[PDB]
Amino acid sequence: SGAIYVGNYRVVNRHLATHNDWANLVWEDSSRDLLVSSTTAQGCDTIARCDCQTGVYYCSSRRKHYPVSFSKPSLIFVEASEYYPARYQSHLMLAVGHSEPGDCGGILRCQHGVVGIVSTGGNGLVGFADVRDLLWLDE
Ligand SMILES: CSc1ccccc1CC(=O)N1C[C@H](C)C[C@H](C(N)=O)C1
Ligand SMILES: [Zn+2]
């Protein structure tokens, strides 16, 4: 689990969004596994606006933060699940590191702020759904 709170927004993994997130739906993209919803309160996370390929992510299954090098946002094939059929997920960044399904929502940060959230994982890999292009989150 895990969310990004920026201004009057809440960014979560689309596969994990609640009835509330869908009742206050601002934007959603199944190809990105992202969903943004309105909040009454003000969020204080800073979204990074950069092209950093290194950072730090939170890994809930280990109760630890890990430093990672990660790939550029791209279309990567992701196998079927209870949430999605077999497909390419866009805006996805891969890194060598530990992850488990329950790790989704874990924030990835660089020195410039919030980069994205854990969304996929593999054999000694971890995927992060990028949020740095969603310029409208700040305004
Ligand atoms: C951190 S996810 C993970 C990690 C290790 C092993 C397996 C997984 C599970 C995984 O990659 N998928 C199921 C997930 C609930 C939705 C993902 C997607 N965005 O389409 C695909
Ligand atoms: Zn950065």
Curated annotation (Swiss-Prot):
Source organism per UniProt: Coxsackievirus A16 (strain G-10)
Known role: Cysteine protease that cleaves viral polyprotein and specific host proteins. It is responsible for the autocatalytic cleavage between the P1 and P2 regions, which is the first cleavage occurring in the polyprotein. Also cleaves the host translation initiation factor EIF4G1, in order to shut down the capped cellular mRNA translation. Inhibits the host nucleus-cytoplasm protein and RNA trafficking by cleaving host members of the nuclear pores. Counteracts stress granule formation probably by antagonizing its assembly or promoting its dissassembly.
Active site location: 15 (for protease 2a activity), 33 (for protease 2a activity), 104 (for protease 2a activity)
Protein name per the record: Protease 2A
Subunit structure: Homodimer.
UniProt-annotated binding residues for Zn(2+) 1: 50, 52, 110, 112
Chemical reaction(s) catalysed: Selective cleavage of Tyr-|-Gly bond in the picornavirus polyprotein
